[PDB]
Amino acid sequence: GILFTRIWRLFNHQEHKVIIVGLDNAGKTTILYQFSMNEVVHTSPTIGSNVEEIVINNTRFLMWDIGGRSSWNTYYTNTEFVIVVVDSTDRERISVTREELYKMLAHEDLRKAGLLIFANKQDVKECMTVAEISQFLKLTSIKDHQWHIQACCALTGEGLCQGLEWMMSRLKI
Ligand SMILES: Nc1nc2c(ncn2[C@@H]2O[C@H](COP(=O)(O)OP(=O)(O)O)[C@@H](OP(=O)(O)O)[C@H]2O)c(=O)[nH]1
């Protein structure tokens, strides 16, 4: 909505580099699409294995599916935030997200990155609760990075304003 646009544009007064990952079908493309509305987008190829580069306004997003790589290490440096999109209805694969997440955080090049966990598809009945996702990903174990888990619905955009607001609060801090 218009409120997201106000906050998003404010955020883009500076340049940013964000990595957005998650298992296939977590809802990454849907979220980026929401971020793209009424903004300027520039996509470009990557010698990237299956990494897609999407620049929205002044924010460079590097997106890719986990759970399918040495090829990612080159992108970590200078990344301010790692956005992990989680399919809240997938109890079967939450362990995969967890395994991959911790394999990424071990890379010293992501030392200063903030971690935003979007618990997506929270609109779906019987989906895992945000508390459950935090528990199954053992987020409290993360003492060296700032993190925030956010309930969201990429279809409606609900939760995206809050997630973006967390990112803004973390930067000029
Ligand atoms: N209920 C529900 N669905 C969501 C949400 N977010 C994304 N989805 C749906 O999940 C599917 C995969 O999303 P997509 O953004 O392509 O995933 P990805 O890019 O991470 O692989 C899409 O369904 P289709 O492939 O059937 O079009 C999409 O509409 C959500 O918050 N709630």
For the chain, the structural domain boundaries read: 1-173
Kindly provide the resolution of this structure in angstroms, with one decimal: 2.0
Distance 121 CA to ligand 1 centre (A): 8
Tokens of 162: 């809050």
Q: Does the structural domain 1-173 have CATH classification 3.40.50.12780?
A: no
Indicate whether residue 97 lines ligand 1 (CB < 6 A): no
Looking at residue 79, the DSSP 8-state letter turns out to be -
The experimental technique used to determine this model is X-ray
Assess contact for 75 and 51: CB atoms under 8 A. Answer: yes
* Binding site listing for GTP: 22-29, 65-68, 120-123, 154
Tokens of 34: 């929401």
Nearest CA to ligand 1 atom 23: 25
97: which residues sit within 8 A by CB, 6+ positions away? 22, 23, 26, 66, 67, 84, 86, 137
Mutation choice for ligand 1 from 30, 100, 123, CB with most ligand atoms inside 8 A:
30
Distance 24 CA to ligand 1 centre (A): 9
Number of H helices, E strands in the chain: 6, 7
Distance 172 CA to ligand 1 centre (A): 32
Residue 117: phi and psi, rounded to 5, are -105, 115
Indicate whether residue 82 lines ligand 1 (CB < 6 A): no
For 157, the enclosing helix (H) or strand (E) is none
